[PDB]
């Protein structure tokens, strides 16, 4: 059995940099530490990095439907490491933003930390059902993981559009 040790440390330093380059790009701030050499996007907002993060979760899920248990476990270890880095750095960041900053940065912290927790359980239902039914190798289980994959994408997009309209008539 082979597990990534150096690649896991490289990935946590990137999600650690993302929270320090996070609430600053949604408003008018000066950030010189944007690493555009390893990224593909225009990048002057949290919106373009969230759209690349939603698309990277959906591409690794497609390989899960091929049936590699090593790519599932690698993503499971990357999911637990990102829980510690994003939920905790967003948790101390909401205390300087519970003051005057709370209206232009308060509901974004709910999308970053609280909505990554709801995406993790819909993903858990896809992972546990694929392990025990992998031993049977029939096409019926491939229709069931694919059906839960469509619900993770349909529930997150429809709820985000209704939350944007609620942010505009706040006052």
Number of strands: 0
Radius of gyration: 18 Å
Q: Indicate the overall shape.
A: globular
The percent of residues in helical segments reads: 55-70%
* Secondary structure tally, helices: 5
Provide the succession of SSEs. HHHHH
Give the termini distance in whole angstroms.
56 Å
Tally of distinct domains: 1
Class of secondary structure makeup = mainly alpha
Which sheet architecture does the biggest sheet show? none
Q: How much of the polypeptide forms β-strand, as a percent range?
A: under 5%
Keywords: DNA replication, DNA-binding, Primosome
Protein name: Replication restart protein PriC
Organism: Cronobacter sakazakii (strain ATCC BAA-894) (Enterobacter sakazakii)
Family: Belongs to the PriC family.
Descriptive notes:
It is classed as dna binding protein. Keywords: DNA replication restart, DNA binding protein. The assembly is monomeric. The entry is titled "Solution Structure of the PriC DNA replication restart protein". The protein: Uncharacterized protein. The chain has 5 helices and no strands. With 171 residues, it is mainly alpha-helical. It has one domain. Helix 3 runs antiparallel to helix 4. The protein is globular and about 55 Å long. It starts with 5 loop residues before the first helix and ends with a helix.
């Amino acid at each position: 059995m082979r597990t990534p040790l150096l690649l896991q440390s490289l990935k946590t330093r990137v999600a650690a940099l993302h929270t320090l380059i996070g609430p600053l790009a949604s408003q008018r701030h000066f950030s010189p530490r944007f690493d555009r050499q390893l990224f593909a996007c225009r990048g002057a907002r949290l919106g373009d990095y969230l759209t690349e993060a939603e698309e990277s979760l959906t591409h690794l899920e497609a390989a899960v439907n091929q049936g590699d248990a090593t790519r599932v476990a690698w993503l499971a270890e990357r999911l637990a490491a990102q829980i510690e880095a994003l939920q905790r750095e967003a948790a101390t960041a909401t205390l300087r933003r519970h003051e005057n900053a709370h209206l232009p940065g308060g509901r974004l912290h709910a999308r970053l930390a609280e909505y990554q927790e709801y995406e993790r359980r819909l993903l858990a239902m896809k992972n546990e059902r694929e392990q025990r039914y992998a031993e049977r190798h029939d096409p019926q289980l491939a229709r069931e993981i694919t059906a839960l994959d469509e619900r993770l994408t349909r529930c997150r997009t429809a709820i985000a559009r209704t939350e944007r309209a609620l942010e505009r008539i706040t006052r």
